[PDB]
Design a protein around this ligand. Structure first.
Ligand SMILES: Nc1ncnc2c1ncn2[C@@H]1O[C@H](COP(=O)(O)OP(=O)(O)OP(O)(O)=S)[C@@H](O)[C@H]1O
Ligand SMILES: Nc1ncnc2c1ncn2[C@@H]1O[C@H](COP(=O)(O)OP(=O)(O)OP(O)(O)=S)[C@@H](O)[C@H]1O
Ligand SMILES: Nc1ncnc2c1ncn2[C@@H]1O[C@H](COP(=O)(O)OP(=O)(O)OP(O)(O)=S)[C@@H](O)[C@H]1O
Ligand SMILES: Nc1ncnc2c1ncn2[C@@H]1O[C@H](COP(=O)(O)OP(=O)(O)O)[C@@H](O)[C@H]1O
Ligand SMILES: [Mg+2]
Ligand SMILES: [Mg+2]
Ligand SMILES: [Mg+2]
Lengths: 257, 341, 257, 331, 330, 320
DNA sequence: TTTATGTACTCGTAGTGTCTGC
DNA sequence: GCAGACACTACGAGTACATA
């Protein structure tokens, strides 16, 4: 009950008090919703970091090329501390940083950050990854790894917005409705796979199969730009309300019996 | 109570003016109850299987089976989740249903049947809605009735035969409960109304109720009571056949599917399905009603009807092996839209 | 009447003897003979070996014509000994190659009589002829002193290293908190003969042992006033606790390197 | 008469099992010896595996040693991995009980105890993997008898360690002596071919046949006419569709006309017969007919198999029956 | 154990007590003997089908290296024993870190059926193996390799135990018959070879049950006929007749023939499906569509039978599938 | 029981940074860190057996010398690295005052760091951020995905790649010249092919072949150690003739003693890692392989199921 | 957020034991 | 010596992961 004690401290404190976390959207900081003055920090603009690295490079004797800082911030995803660590490590043996080995360094130090469920649905439903050219770098193994980040929300996220897009990967002679039906078939198959996974048998080696049948194949036929925008899953709320309604139905069934 | 469905129920086999052959068979069983085997009554719902079970129970021991009480029993599962399920017990018998969560009704069956078997020689254990068991409690039952039988007996009531596994079919006697004939429905409704105080212009209303009920006497009695209450206790020959709001929703969904075959109409179909699943409805019956309402639309072709029924069979198989019914139902509607378009 | 009879003077003796090595051993293989009763049992890790032996003089009456192999379980044995008044006189009873033994918990000397029985356990492991050998050193220190030293040193490191060289006992235990270096000089006292640090010398030894196993050894210090430790570079450590008529060894296996 | 005829006439001797002659002779010759292997009984339900194992245990030890040297587990009992790891392992590693003078003199007591795991196909694979080396290590002191009706659920190592005894289905030829004996003992008036009909309807089991015979005898006792039980009463009580309704179904199927077959299927399901029985009747009518082409028979055989599998999955039988009839009608 | 031998099944009675008594795996046995004579013994990993002689080989190896009391010097853990990561952290660590208690030798750890260990247990076992490998060797017996962590696979020397060939089964059968004073006809021996499917326990069990089957254990010889009633497997002549009736004869004759064959001595549709599969694999088919249809339909039928169902409908399905598959070829 | 000779895997483990082959840039950077002394926090990741933890140990040995007994705290999965009983250990070790050379710091080798819980890494976050002047950390995990992003935000990412055939061959030839065993180039290339860039596997196969036949010729190598079954599975799935695929299946997997579930899992992995055929075709191949996988896991494991899987894979591959 | 076992981790609590003290 | 104080092991409830 640490978060509850911290919230109760926030209600009653006679000293200045601040908190530092990373993800407000987690439900465990939900009580902090209106007990604190929220200040949001974002990804800084590349100009200030560029100036700081110019000062650091001219102070630490190694040469730095201005066009390289943009790609370093882009690949590091706005992580200034990791940028400084990258500069130090590169300057250990190769003090000169040019535009030749920029792609080598960017690929070697690329950060495989986890992805949020809405962004997971957006990347899964993007029509470029299933194109011929787009599959050379983003192979289906990367799609499985992207699913496995959040394996509890991706099957629910794909199902609720795979029918609210313009499809961009339609086969010739195939309409949008046919693709929707053929995706729904494999979603139904993934339901059965999940039921075998989460049962008494408890076959958890079947997760990679469920990944394909519930996220990859259904989104490989309806890929495209959103008709509206990605909506949060509603099956959880509908299922909760249905469970409570079932409980109240059982109460009146037993009372009148 | 004021409801007519539970006000006029035949207590004895003598009052069972429904099936002469089935009543005679039950009386044959009740003639020598010293060696009565485990039973399994199957048939369409609303036939009156539970009425036969209670009538046989009071024919075995005597009057007093129909007095009932409620005894909530606390049951603990994995971790410390509490799913206390009450049992509708009574002297001389015990009534249980798998209304508990299906994934862990096996423990309810195991410890409750072991508790009742600690000792008029046997106590009958009626299991309503036995087709809803999850093939795990049935495994316990296989040896439960076989090992202890001189002290416990089961009257295993279910409206369908397919989910019941082979050994349970093997060790239980099978009793068949056909649905009433339309003439018998009209006769029962006429006896009810003449014992009641509702005025009828012509017995054609009873025949119309029999036709609309489709062999289901329970919903027939419910609809007759609703009509009598709505018609100021005087039925009219021009009274429209009132349907359950569920049937209205299914028919509106079928009309929306038939007329508009776009993705957006599928979105409203999904919303309607979400509402219906929130409205305490099993997946099998809703898919069956949707399929049979789709096949009753006259603008279809025989090829479209065959495709619809084949995909309905496929997706019903999928329902029998799935957890979230919404995906299977949405897939079935998508396939229907693809075929009709 | 029964072939094997062993009536203890008091249930307290057997309770203490069982509780001496109950924790460190799960399966015990008693071997009753006319010379006495022995029990060679091995730990689950197969590192610590216990060799119980009770002479015929510790029994008020004893008679066993045929050798009997009583393989048992110490958990259930201790559970059986847990119930029953400690002043009562226990009488072990067994048949000719039986499936169980009978624990006569005769209350006081009359009235209440108990018939607790424990099903015999099929342990086919033969007794191991590890009696003794030419040990390099033979020291003898009071049980309380050794228990206190081991308990103090176990909090400082996970390994206690026992070193003997030139008539001197030295315990060292280097760890994270610190490094104990408890040392003992041998002596003898006529005033209090119980406390006397006896010693013998053939070759210096530097053998290291685990902490938990040494704690398991010192849990049995309540049985004997004196404990005798014998070490060798090519032999397991021996901890001979002297009993009223027999003994209770503890063959501990040292670590290497 | 305090018990049903199923358990009242349950075999009490190994010779009383009037089927599975190979397994019974093997078990008897093993009873003479002591080399009892880890058994694995399998077959259709009602073939007599539990009866055989109980008779074998009773003849091995006797009524006194049932409670001491027999451990029987079910799916009703908890059979998690912890139970297999502790309870079964402890009972296996315990030494055998002490046979008395009476038991040793009268019965051929062997120096081992049998662990019977009824309906063992329901255990998780992890529990079976834990059971493997328990079975292997303590072979000299305990015997394992796995009684499952599905082999495929039992993992490969247990099927390798356990000697397999398939229990053959009990058709009309195999198990007619038992039914005749039961009729003689119970004084049940019977027709000539009534028992053959009973064994035909009871597909590969004798428990169902005994239950059907008991029901028919009870009905005849109620009527009290002293009349032999005809095939009609048994056929009606068995729940199989009469030939008139099946002929009507075939006539509706032959003409096509989806609306007519749909209406007749609705009425038929209102009358409420078991759809598996209807599929069986349709199979024994269509396949044995000689008025149909080869290609039609291929397609209808595949259709009947698919419908039977889908029904065995445990689905709504109305839709499956309608689909099967419509698919047959379009052939 | 009780009453020494002669009260055990033939599976556990004829367990090899020496590395010379292991047949079939000549290369593995010779390599292991060379290893232990030259004094080097790396972390061994024995992989193979059930019944091929993995645990027998490692038990014989531990008996050869140590004395008679090999169990006093080996920490042999199995799936029956609890093998959580706490067990690895305490029992395995203590056994590997300490010195031998009965003589001067290296500790040996045998982990039979180690595929059942959890991922975290294998992760701990990785560093446990790699740290204390100076005077402790780990042996891992695994039937399944996909359940083993690739780090664990990359650490132990892999030995593959192939299914037993014909000669090894023949030699073991000859030894068993010599011991048991039993006689067996060569055709029965060939039937046993075909019935084994690479398993040795199946051979020993069938020999035991067939000796029990005979009225007179001596004198009478075990023929393939006795093998086929005792095991219950279909005879090859029955399979050939059924397949011929299906291929050439019409539905009435084929259905009657299959029913008669099944009801003659209680055959099951299973073992008959893959008997037919073997016979059809012994054919040459011009069109790949025949092979595709046969494989798919027979796999579906075998799956349905594994789930259970009506045997008559499944037999009709088998006949229909075969007859429909052998008409697309022309 | 004679004392066993140390295996060649551990006997010839490198003790200096020069002997590690492969990833020349990473090794040179580690050497420059070694002589420079300013070791930063780093996380080392890669496939198993390519020299991850040995580089960590060699760098720890080189940076600080006689202080190696107490100046480095090594932790692993065998130690119960939890949130509570272990935060105090690193807290004390980092707070421990030990006098080093001016450019050297204490090293905390959290070996096998991908197995730690989330809370342990959350505590390690501020533990690393506070005492960055005194102690430095060294994570060595097979997979870097388990490490949370705050830990990745303050660490130097050193990604090792699978060893090239030339470097493995070079170090193998070094081992042969130190051991003087007769070798043939065909046998060496067979060892390289079997190892698949896994160095410890190469050394173990070399050990087995040397001590089993004396000569490491290709025939002896293939006799002792089998070719990797992923390659056989990939060959089987890519064949054009169904009869050829069935024959490869039977002869190379069913008669070689491979479980059906192993074949199915390897086929799934090969299909998901395959790139020659069209993406959609791989999708239906994965779906069918998964259906066969469900059939195998439900209990029915038979040659017929694998044959049906291959038949349907050929149905999809040949485009009806 | 339902899932549905088995595993592992973490914390909290309740006693149980020996250790100081008057 | 009895009483309190003390820190220890043992136990129970809760959460989170499950393929690379
Ligand atoms: N061969 C047989 N001879 C005589 N009676 C038999 C035979 N097989 C079955 N029965 C009868 O079947 C009933 C009990 O059979 P069981 O042994 O319980 O069948 P089963 O093997 O248990 O089937 P399960 O357990 O549902 S798979 C008794 O009424 C027996 O008389
Ligand atoms: N090569 C062989 N030579 C002789 N007997 C063998 C051979 N392989 C197996 N056996 C016999 O098979 C019996 C059981 O096989 P085991 O080797 O003990 O177990 P396993 O072969 O390792 O199978 P798993 O994987 O442990 S279930 C042994 O007792 C032997 O009698
Ligand atoms: N580049 C290399 N140069 C020389 N030997 C190497 C090299 N890479 C690995 N080895 C050998 O591999 C063995 C130990 O490798 P490790 O580094 O311990 O494996 P690893 O990189 O830690 O992989 P994991 O994840 O721990 S299984 C020793 O015998 C080393 O000699
Ligand atoms: N012989 C009969 N005469 C009149 N009503 C009957 C008869 N049998 C059954 N019913 C009616 O059936 C209703 C009970 O049906 P029920 O047993 O609940 O069906 P189900 O078992 O299918 O749910 C009662 O309201 C009763 O009026
Ligand atoms: Mg049974
Ligand atoms: Mg083994
Ligand atoms: Mg490593």
């Amino acid at each position: 009950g640490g978060v509850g004690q911290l919230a109760q401290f926030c209600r009653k404190t006679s000293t200045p008090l601040i908190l530092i976390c990373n993800e407000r959207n987690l439900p465990k900081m939900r009580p902090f919703d209106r007990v604190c003055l929220d200040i949001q920090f974002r990804r800084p603009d590349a100009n200030s970091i560029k100036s700081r690295l110019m000062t650091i490079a001219i102070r630490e004797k190694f040469k730095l090329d201005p066009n390289v800082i943009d790609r370093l911030i882009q690949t590091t995803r706005g992580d200034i501390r990791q940028v400084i660590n990258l500069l130090s490590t590169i300057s250990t043996t190769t003090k000169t940083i040019n535009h030749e080995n920029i792609n080598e360094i960017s690929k070697a130090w690329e950060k495989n950050i986890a992805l949020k469920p809405f962004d997971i649905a957006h990347k899964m439903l993007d029509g470029q990854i299933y194109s011929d050219i787009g599959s050379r770098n983003f192979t289906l193994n990367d799609k499985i790894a992207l699913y496995f980040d959040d394996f509890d929300f991706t099957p629910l996220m794909i199902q609720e917005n795979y029918l609210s897009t313009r499809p961009s990967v339609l086969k010739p002679g195939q309409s949008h409705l046919e693709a929707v039906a053929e995706a729904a078939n494999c979603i139904s198959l993934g339901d059965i796979v999940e039921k075998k996974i989460r049962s008494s048998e408890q076959l958890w080696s079947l997760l990679p199969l469920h990944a394909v049948l519930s996220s990859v194949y259904p989104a490989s036929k309806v890929a495209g730009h959103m008709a509206g925008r990605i909506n949060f899953t509603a099956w959880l709320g509908q299922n909760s309300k249905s469970a409570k309604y079932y409980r109240l139905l059982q109460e009146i069934h037993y009372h009148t019996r | 109570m004021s409801l007519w469905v539970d006000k006029y129920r035949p207590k004895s086999l003598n009052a069972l003016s429904h099936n002469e052959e089935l009543t005679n068979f039950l009386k044959s069983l009740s003639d020598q109850p010293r060696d009565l085997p485990h039973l399994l009554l199957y048939g369409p719902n609303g036939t009156g299987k539970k009425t036969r079970c209670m009538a046989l129970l009071e024919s075995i021991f005597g009057p007093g089976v129909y007095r009932l009480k409620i005894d909530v029993r606390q049951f603990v599962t994995a971790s410390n989740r509490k799913l206390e399920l009450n049992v509708v017990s009574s002297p001389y018998h015990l009534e249980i249903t798998p209304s508990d969560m299906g994934n862990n009704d096996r423990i309810v069956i195991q410890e409750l049947l072991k508790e009742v078997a600690q000792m008029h020689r046997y106590k009958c254990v009626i299991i309503n809605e036995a087709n809803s068991l999850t093939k795990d409690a049935q495994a316990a039952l296989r040896r439960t009735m076989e090992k202890y039988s001189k002290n416990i007996r089961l009257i295993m009531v279910c409206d369908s035969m397919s989910p019941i596994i082979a050994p349970i079919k093997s060790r239980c006697l099978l009793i068949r409960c056909p649905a009433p004939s339309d003439s018998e429905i009209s006769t029962i409704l006429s006896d009810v109304v003449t014992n009641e105080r509702i005025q009828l212009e012509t017995k054609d209303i009873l025949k119309r109720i029999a036709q609309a009920s489709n062999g289901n006497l329970r919903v027939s009695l419910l609809m007759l009571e609703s009509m009598a209450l709505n018609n100021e206790l005087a039925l009219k020959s021009s009274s429209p056949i009132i349907k359950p709001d569920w049937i209205i929703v299914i028919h509106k969904l079928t009309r929306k599917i038939v007329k508009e075959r776009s993705v957006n109409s599928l979105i409203e179909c999904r919303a309607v399905l979400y509402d219906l699943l929130a409205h305490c409805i099993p997946a099998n019956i809703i898919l069956k009603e949707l399929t049979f309402s789709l096949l009753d639309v006259e603008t279809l072709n025989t090829t479209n009807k065959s495709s619809i029924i084949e995909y309905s069979s496929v997706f019903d198989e999928r329902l029998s092996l799935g957890n979230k019914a919404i995906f299977h139902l949405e897939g079935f509607i998508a396939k229907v839209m693809c075929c009709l378009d | 009447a029964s072939m094997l009879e062993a009536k203890f003077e008091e249930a307290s003796l057997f309770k203490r003897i069982i509780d001496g090595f109950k924790d460190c051993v799960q399966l015990v293989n008693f071997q009753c003979k006319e010379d006495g009763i022995i029990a060679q049992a091995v730990d689950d890790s197969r590192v610590l070996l216990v060799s119980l032996e009770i002479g015929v003089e510790a029994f008020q009456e004893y008679r066993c014509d045929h050798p009997v192999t009583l393989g048992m379980d110490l958990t259930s044995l201790s559970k059986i000994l847990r119930c029953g008044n400690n002043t009562d006189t226990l009488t072990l009873i067994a048949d000719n190659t039986p499936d169980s033994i009978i624990l006569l918990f005769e209350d006081t000397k009359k009235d209440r009589i108990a018939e607790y029985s424990l099903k015999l356990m099929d342990i086919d492991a033969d007794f191991l002829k590890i009696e003794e050998l030419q040990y390099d050193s033979t020291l003898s220190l009071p049980s309380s002193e050794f228990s206190k030293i081991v308990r103090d040193l176990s909090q400082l490191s996970d390994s206690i290293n026992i070193m003997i060289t030139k008539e001197t006992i030295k315990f060292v235990a280097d760890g994270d908190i610190g490094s104990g270096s408890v040392i003992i000089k041998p002596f003898v006292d006529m005033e209090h003969p119980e406390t006397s640090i006896k010693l013998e010398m053939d070759q210096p030894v530097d053998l290291t042992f685990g902490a938990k196993y040494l704690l398991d050894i010192i849990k049995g210090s309540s049985l004997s006033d004196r404990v005798g430790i014998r070490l060798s570079s090519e032999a397991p450590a021996l901890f001979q606790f002297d009993l009223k008529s027999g003994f209770l060894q503890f063959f501990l296996a040292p670590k290497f390197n | 008469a305090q018990q049903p005829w199923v358990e009242k006439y349950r075999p009490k001797n190994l010779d009383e099992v009037t089927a599975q002659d190979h397994a019974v002779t093997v078990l008897k010759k093993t009873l003479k010896s002591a080399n009892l292997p880890h058994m694995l009984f399998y077959g259709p339900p009602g073939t007599g595996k539990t009866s055989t194992i109980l008779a074998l245990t009773k003849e091995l030890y006797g009524p006194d040693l049932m409670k001491s040297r027999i451990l029987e587990l079910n799916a009703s009992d908890e059979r998690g991995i912890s139970i297999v790891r502790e309870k079964v392992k402890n009972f296996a590693r315990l030494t055998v009980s002490k046979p008395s003078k009476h038991d040793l003199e009268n019965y051929p007591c062997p120096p081992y105890k049998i662990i019977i795991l009824d309906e063992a196909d329901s255990m998780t694979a992890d529990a079976q993997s834990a059971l493997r080396r328990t079975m292997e290590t303590y072979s000299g002191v305990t015997r394992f008898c796995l009684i499952c009706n599905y082999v495929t659920r039992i993992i490969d190592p247990l099927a390798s360690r356990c000697s397999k005894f398939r229990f053959k289905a009990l058709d009309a030829s195999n198990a007619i002596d038992r039914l005749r004996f039961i009729s003689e003992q119970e004084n049940v008036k019977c027709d000539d071919g009534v028992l053959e009909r009973i064994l035909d309807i009871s597909a590969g089991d004798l428990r169902r046949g005994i239950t059907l015979l008991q029901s028919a005898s009870k009905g005849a006792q109620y009527l009290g006419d002293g009349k032999n039980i005809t095939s009609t009463q048994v056929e009606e009580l068995a729940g199989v569709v009469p030939h008139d309704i099946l002929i009507e179904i075939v006539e509706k199927v032959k003409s096509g006309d989806f609306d007519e077959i749909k209406k007749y299927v609705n009425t038929f399901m209102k009358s409420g017969w078991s759809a598996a029985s209807v599929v069986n009747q349709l199979h024994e009518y269509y396949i044995t007919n000689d008025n149909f082409d080869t290609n039609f028979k291929n397609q209808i055989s595949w259709l009947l198999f698919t419908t039977d599998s889908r029904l065995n999955n445990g689905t709504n039988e109305h839709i499956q029956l309608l689909n099967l009839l419509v698919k047959i009608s379009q052939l | 154990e009780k009453r020494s031998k002669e009260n055990l099944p033939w599976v556990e009675k004829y367990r090899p007590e020496t590395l010379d008594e292991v047949y079939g795996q000549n290369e593995v046995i010779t390599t292991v003997r060379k290893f232990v004579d030259e004094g080097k013994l790396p972390h061994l990993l024995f992989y193979g089908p059930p019944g091929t002689g993995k645990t027998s080989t490692i038990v014989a190896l531990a008996r050869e290296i140590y004395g008679k009391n090999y169990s006093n010097m080996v920490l042999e853990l199995n799936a029956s024993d609890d093998r959580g990561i706490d067990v690895v952290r305490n029992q395995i660590k203590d056994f590997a870190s300490t010195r031998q208690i009965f003589s001067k030798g290296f500790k040996l750890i045998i982990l039979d059926e180690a595929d059942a260990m959890t991922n975290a247990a294998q992760n701990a076992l990785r560093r446990v193996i790699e740290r204390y490998t100076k005077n402790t060797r780990f042996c891992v017996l695994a039937n399944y390799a996909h359940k083993l962590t690739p780090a664990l696979l990359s650490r132990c020397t892999r030995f593959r135990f192939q299914p037993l060939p014909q000669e090894a089964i023949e030699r073991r059968i000859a030894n068993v018959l010599v011991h048991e004073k039993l006689k067996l006809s060569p055709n029965a021996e060939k039937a046993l070879i075909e019935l084994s499917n690479g398993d040795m326990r199946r051979v020993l069990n069938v020999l035991q049950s067939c000796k029990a089957t005979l009225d007179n254990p001596d004198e009478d010889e075990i023929s393939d006929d006795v093998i086929y009633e005792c095991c219950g497997a279909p005879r090859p002549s029955d399979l050939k007749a059924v397949l011929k009736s299906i291929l050439e004869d019409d539905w009435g004759t084929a259905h009657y023939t299959l029913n008669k064959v099944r009801s003659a001595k209680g055959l099951a549709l299973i073992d008959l499906i893959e008997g037919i599969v073997k016979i059809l694999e012994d054919y040459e088919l011009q069109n790949e569509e025949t092979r595709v249809h046969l494989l798919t339909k027979l796999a579906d039928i075998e799956y349905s039978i594994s789930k259970g169902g009506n045997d008559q409908i499944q037999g009709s399905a088998v006949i229909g599938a075969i007859k429909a598959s052998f008409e697309n070829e022309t | 029981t004679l004392s066993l000779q140390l295996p060649w895997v551990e006997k010839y483990r490198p003790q200096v940074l020069s002997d590690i082959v492969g990833n020349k840039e990473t090794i040179d950077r580690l050497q420059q860190i070694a002589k420079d002394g300013n070791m930063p926090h780093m996380i080392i990741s890669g496939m198993p057996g390519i020299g991850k933890t040995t580089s960590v140990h060699c760098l720890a040995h080189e940076l600080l010398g006689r202080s190696y007994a107490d100046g480095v705290l090594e932790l692993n999965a065998s130690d119960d690295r939890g949130i509570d009983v272990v935060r105090n250990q690193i807290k004390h070790f980092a707070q421990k005052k030990l006098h080093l050379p001016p450019g050297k710091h204490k090293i905390v080798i959290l070996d096998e760091a991908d197995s730690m819980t989330a809370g342990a890494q959350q505590a390690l976050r501020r533990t690393m951020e506070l005492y960055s002047n005194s102690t430095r950390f060294a994570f060595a995990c097979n997979q870097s995905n388990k490490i949370i992003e705050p830990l990745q935000s303050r660490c130097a990412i050193l990604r090792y790649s699978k060893l090239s055939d030339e470097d493995v061959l070079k170090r193998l030839l070094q081992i042969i010249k130190l051991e003087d065993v007769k070798y043939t180039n065909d046998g060496l290339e067979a060892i390289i092919f079997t190892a698949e860039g896994d160095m410890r596997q190469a050394i173990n196969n070399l050990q087995s072949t040397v001590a089993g036949h004396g000569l490491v010729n290709a025939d002896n190598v293939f006799k002792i150690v089998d070719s990797p079954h992923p390659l056989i599975v990939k060959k089987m799935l890519l064949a054009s003739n169904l009869e050829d695929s069935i024959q490869i299946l039977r002869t190379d997997l069913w008669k070689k003693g491979y479980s059906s579930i192993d074949i199915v899992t390897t086929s799934f992995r090969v299909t998901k890692n395959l790139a020659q055929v069209k993406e959609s075709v791989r999708l239906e191949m994965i779906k069918e392989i998964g259906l066969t996988h469900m059939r195998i896991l439900e209990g029915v494991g038979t040659y017929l199921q694998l044959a049906s899987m291959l038949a349907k894979i050929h149905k999809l591959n040949n485009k009806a």
